[PDB]
Amino acid sequence: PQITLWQRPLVTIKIGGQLKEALLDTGADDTVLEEMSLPGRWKPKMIGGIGGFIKVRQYDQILIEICGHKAIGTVLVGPTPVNIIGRNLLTQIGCTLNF
Amino acid sequence: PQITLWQRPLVTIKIGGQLKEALLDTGADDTVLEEMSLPGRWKPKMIGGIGGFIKVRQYDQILIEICGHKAIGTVLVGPTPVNIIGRNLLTQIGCTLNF
Numbered sequence: 001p002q003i004t005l006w007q008r009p010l011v012t013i014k015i016g017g018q019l020k021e022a023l024l025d026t027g028a029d030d031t032v033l034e035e036m037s038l039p040g041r042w043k044p045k046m047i048g049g050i051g052g053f054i055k056v057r058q059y060d061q062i063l064i065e066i067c068g069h070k071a072i073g074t075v076l077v078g079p080t081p082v083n084i085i086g087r088n089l090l091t092q093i094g095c096t097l098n099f
Numbered sequence: 100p101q102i103t104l105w106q107r108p109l110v111t112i113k114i115g116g117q118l119k120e121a122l123l124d125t126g127a128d129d130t131v132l133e134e135m136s137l138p139g140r141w142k143p144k145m146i147g148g149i150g151g152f153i154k155v156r157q158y159d160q161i162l163i164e165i166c167g168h169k170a171i172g173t174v175l176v177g178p179t180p181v182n183i184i185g186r187n188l189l190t191q192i193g194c195t196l197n198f
């Protein structure tokens with residue numbers, strides 16, 4: 001698809017058999033998801049931006065399907081207001097910036 | 100141009116006669132640059148960040164050339180981790196996401 005920037009680039013994602021809204025974010029190195037329960041072990045991490053930092057849980061090899069495209073990689077889970085799809089998964093699905 | 104995302108989409112911008120590096124950030128509503136002097140009036144503005152809002156200076160109708168594309172719009176100046184070009188100016192240069 002081609003996603004416009006007149007609005008936040010929100011798309012539907014699926015993790016497990018859960019569908020969620022997520023932002024396609026070229027400024028994010030990493031993918032950050034709203035608080036949710038994922039199986040398995042993880043690593044503590046702190047991620048930051050304007051304002052400061054929040055604590056997240058790093059899970060590896062997590063499948064997220066983005067508009068029918070299956071991406072697998074590291075996800076961070078924490079108290080974010082928005083599900084953020086970062087470059088680590090945007091590359092896998094063939095996403096580019098064009099102008 | 101077509102920009103892939105295996106690295107940060109950092110580009111050269113020209114603002115106030117200065118060359119700077121900035122990040123093309125579809126996850127950002129607004130363009131936010133590190134502390135600099137800009138011509139004309141500014142107004143205090145609070146913008147949302149991690150763990151709360153942050154003060155920035157708002158300058159309107161500022162010329163910015165991003166990769167050779169002209170934009171004229173609002174630039175916020177404040178304590179951002181990196182110079183970010185957000186959707187307010189990404190729409191002006193014709194940017195979309197594609198996969």
Ligand SMILES: Cc1cccc(C)c1OCC(=O)N(Cc1ccccc1)C[C@H]1CNC[C@@H]1CN(CC(C)C)S(=O)(=O)c1ccccc1
Nearest residue numbers: 027028032047048049050080126127131147148149150179
């Ligand atoms: C605004 C806000 C409120 C509360 C919580 C969150 C998560 C939040 O968003 C932060 C966020 O969206 N992140 C950062 C983030 C996401 C998830 C958890 C923590 C931080 C993604 C990066 C990339 N795309 C937009 C952001 C660009 N950043 C610059 C970047 C180099 C970090 S930045 O420092 O946040 C920023 C935001 C606004 C103005 C100026 C600068």
Ligand SMILES: [Cl-]
Nearest residue numbers: 072073074088
């Ligand atoms: Cl990854």
Ligand SMILES: [Cl-]
Nearest residue numbers: 171172173187
């Ligand atoms: Cl603007």
